[PDB]
């Protein structure tokens, strides 16, 4: 590839990843203006490139913010995963009387491969559905648990 | 605390985390039915607890799926962060002619503290706005970059 081709495919890679993430506050984020020279109404091959490199560097701050937000969600999901595991030990300890079903570890492995095999719209939808069904299940359980 | 109180506060902790994450496919997710004994129409202190422990264990599979999805988004955001850094080196190397502005590292540290200090609705909104402004900025830049 050449210079303009590596630029094109590198930007195409970044743009695809942004769409994968997307599924009052008066903040100043870099935008493209007419005087910046990136328009046909005054196209400057150098003035535009100065604005591009400047805007991306001024955008690089908010990219670190996004990684902190998505890491917080990763730490959030891992916390719900472990807090449920403790909730199992709490309930079985209070029971102490066991007709208990435990899922098959290899059946779960076959399901996780199938859940992640479908495309991104189905997986974003699956993530959307799992959250609602589990919260509704806990609210129904907690209500009956408080009646004791 | 007592037995029923530790159950209540542990579930309250899990339910809060699920709402923090929430901002065709025919999947079988555990639900609460009338015969399960968790309703007033037939309330069984033991039959309900058997369904609770069973449903949560059968839910524990889909909790591992959620952690894989949010980790994928964390790896996705970190990839956009590093791919932009390479895009800077690509553009400056093609320029080679420098009236370049580089942001202040401590000014960015003051902003990141303020961006994360606001509540979750503002931060989910800020995450929403940063993604749109950066993709629109790249599409405007790439268009002018292809005209060269």
């Amino acid at each position, epitope marked *: *590839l*050449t210079s*303009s*081709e590596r630029i*094109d*495919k590198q*930007i*195409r890679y970044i*743009l*695809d990843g942004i*769409s994968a993430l997307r599924k009052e506050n008066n903040l100043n984020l870099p935008k*493209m203006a007419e005087k910046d020279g*990136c*328009f*046909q*109404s005054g196209f400057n091959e150098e003035t535009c490139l100065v604005k591009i490199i400047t805007g991306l560097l001024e955008f690089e701050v908010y990219l670190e913010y996004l990684q902190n937000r998505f890491e917080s969600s990763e730490e959030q999901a891992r916390a719900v995963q472990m807090s449920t595991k403790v909730l199992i030990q709490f309930l079985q300890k209070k029971a102490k009387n066991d007709a208990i079903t435990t899922p098959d570890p290899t059946t779960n492995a076959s399901l996780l491969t199938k859940l992640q095999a479908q495309n991104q719209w189905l997986q974003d939808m699956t993530t959307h559905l799992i959250l609602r069904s589990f919260k509704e299940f806990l609210q129904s359980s907690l209500r009956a648990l408080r009646q004791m | 605390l007592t037995s029923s109180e530790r159950i209540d506060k542990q579930i309250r902790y899990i339910l809060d985390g699920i709402s923090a994450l929430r901002k065709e496919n025919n999947l079988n997710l555990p639900k609460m039915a009338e015969k399960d004994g968790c309703f007033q129409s037939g309330f069984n202190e033991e039959t309900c607890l058997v369904k609770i422990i069973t449903g949560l264990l059968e839910f524990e599979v889909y909790l591992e799926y959620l952690q894989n999805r949010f980790e994928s988004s964390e790896e996705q955001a970190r990839a956009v962060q590093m791919s932009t850094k390479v895009l800077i080196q690509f553009l400056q190397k093609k320029a080679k002619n420098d009236a370049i502005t580089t942001p202040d590292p401590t000014t960015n540290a003051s902003l990141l503290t303020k961006l994360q200090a606001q509540n979750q609705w503002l931060q989910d909104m800020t995450t929403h706005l940063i993604l*749109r402004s950066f*993709k*629109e900025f*790249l*599409q*405007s830049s*790439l*268009r002018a970059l*292809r*005209q*060269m």
Partner: antibody, heavy 124, light 108 residues
Framework: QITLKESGPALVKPTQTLTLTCTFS??????????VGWIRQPPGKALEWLAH???????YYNPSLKSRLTISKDTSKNQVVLTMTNMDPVDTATYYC????????????????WGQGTLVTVSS | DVVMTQSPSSLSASVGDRVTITCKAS??????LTWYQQKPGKAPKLLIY???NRYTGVPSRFSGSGSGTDFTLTISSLQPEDFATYYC?????????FGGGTKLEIKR
């Protein structure tokens, strides 16, 4: 459902204004990476790209016809208008408007949605 | 600014035959090239995008290839349904120039 439909006169006198209007439905021209272009085809001839307008009003034209070409948009009515003045019989053609979407991504299909096309005859 | 040239301008093949249509660019447009199929009078129908990636619904017998300045559209086993004119468009830089088009005729 995505629909683009051209509207305009089927007959224009020589040296008289031609006003074409493309009305679309199913997408917003204010969406990032979205754009609408104009392409014409003289009877039995090859295609010729005319003009294009992007979401940020950065208008582009074919360099040969920019003198008589003015494109503009109204995102509140979903309308893109291409205006040709001082029409000549050489510019009689079927005029299409097409949708360009997801410009920089791997889903830049190109002109993936077209209209039926309006046959424009120029004669007194 | 950019000139696309197609060869041949016309072609005639049998049913079940293979068709080869080429398109050249005056300057590199990377893989950002798009093929269209046009029936008489009707608006063009999208076939290939990004040189070698197939648009939704297009039969598997249509396959494009190439990059830079050499591009080729291939119809494996020709059906009589494929009677049309095939066009070549570069989407890299304005003007988004079309090719001359290749008129495909069916033999019998």
């Amino acid at each position: 459902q995505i629909t683009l439909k051209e509207s305009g006169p089927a007959l224009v006198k020589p040296t008289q204004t031609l006003t074409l209007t493309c009305t679309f439905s199913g997408f917003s021209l204010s969406t990032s990476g979205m754009g609408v272009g104009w392409i014409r085809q003289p009877p039995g001839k090859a295609l010729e790209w005319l003009a294009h307008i992007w979401w940020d009003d950065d208008k582009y034209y074919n360099p040969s016809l920019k003198s008589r070409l003015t494109i503009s948009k109204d995102t509140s009515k979903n309308q893109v208008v291409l205006t040709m003045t001082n029409m000549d019989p050489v510019d009689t053609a079927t005029y299409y408007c097409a949708r360009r979407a997801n410009y920089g991504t791997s889903y830049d299909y190109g002109m993936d949605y077209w209209g039926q096309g309006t046959l424009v005859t120029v004669s007194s | 600014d950019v000139v696309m040239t197609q060869s041949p301008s016309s072609l005639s093949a049998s049913v079940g035959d293979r068709v080869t249509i080429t398109c050249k660019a005056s300057q590199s447009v990377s893989d950002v090239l798009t093929w269209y199929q046009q029936k008489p009078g009707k608006a063009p129908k999208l076939l290939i995008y990004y040189a070698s990636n197939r648009y939704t619904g297009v039969p598997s017998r249509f396959s494009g290839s190439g990059s830079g300045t050499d591009f080729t559209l291939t119809i494996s086993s020709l059906q009589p349904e494929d009677f049309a004119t095939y066009y070549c468009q570069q989407g890299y830089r304005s003007p988004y120039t079309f090719g001359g088009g290749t008129k495909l005729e069916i033999k019998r």
